[PDB]
């Protein structure tokens, strides 16, 4: 086509979606990770995770307001990944890398799994 | 912080939200523009438009499944802007620039209004 493109548009959209998340505006699901609860937008979760994409396209699960993750999932690892979904920034540290990689594999977040594998390979 | 950032994340999120829109997945509102209807995600509309942000943060309008725009709004101009919201690409043409600018002013989409004003000033 003959379209023009606004370079910062996608980043500005995500920044605003994160602002809605911070103020709990139009969040439509609670993700339960053991004793912790995380409110989010189903659409953002699907856009970032192969697991959430599969969950919310299911004709029965699409209508659930609460989703319980596998008990092996670490709430801190999930929190780090939820923040990454809404910001593009990943708080990857020596102390959390194993939990973050395990959580990203479960959530099916391929680019996160890739950087974790590379950071782990560098330290061996 | 000491975060790392994935450059393409925001663009990939928006591409996936547009894929959900194309398949009519988890759309939660119909925007009525005269005889035309446009299905969308309230969160994406709020993230792109000062008017939709104001509408869906209202305690009564947040619950509406149908929103009727002012009858002066052109359905083609709205369609072009809805596509821009989900893609960052704006189909700005000599034949549609006036309708697109009028629609972007109504929707409170400041960057679109700015490029329309500049393209109009160049042709005078």
């Amino acid at each position: 086509d003959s379209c023009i493109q606004f370079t910062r548009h996608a980043s500005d959209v995500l920044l605003n979606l994160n602002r809605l998340r911070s103020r709990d505006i139009l969040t439509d699901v609670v993700i339960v990770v053991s004793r912790e609860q995380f409110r989010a937008h189903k659409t953002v979760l699907m856009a970032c995770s192969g697991l959430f994409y599969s969950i919310f396209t299911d004709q029965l699960k699409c209508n659930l307001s609460v989703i319980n993750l596998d008990p092996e999932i670490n709430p801190e690892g999930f929190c780090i990944l939820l923040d990454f979904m809404y910001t593009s920034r990943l708080n990857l540290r020596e102390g959390n890398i194993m939990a973050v990689m395990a959580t990203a594999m479960y959530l099916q977040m391929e680019h996160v799994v890739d950087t974790c594998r590379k950071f782990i390979k560098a330290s061996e | 912080d000491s975060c790392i950032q994935f450059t393409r994340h925001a663009s990939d999120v928006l591409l996936n939200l547009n894929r959900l829109r194309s398949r009519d997945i988890l759309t939660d509102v119909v925007i009525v523009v005269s005889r035309e209807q446009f299905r969308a995600h309230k969160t994406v509309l709020m993230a792109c438009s000062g008017l939709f942000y104001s509408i869906f943060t209202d305690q009564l309008k947040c619950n509406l499944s149908v929103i009727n725009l002012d009858p002066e709004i052109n359905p083609e101009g709205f369609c072009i802007l809805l596509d821009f919201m989900y893609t960052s690409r704006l189909n700005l043409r000599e034949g549609n620039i006036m309708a697109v600018m009028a629609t972007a002013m109504y929707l409170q989409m400041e960057h679109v209004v700015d490029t329309c004003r500049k393209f109009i000033k160049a042709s005078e």
Binding site: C3, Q5, F6 | -
Partner: peptide
């Protein structure tokens, strides 16, 4: 704005 750019030419994509």
């Amino acid at each position: 704005w750019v030419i994509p």
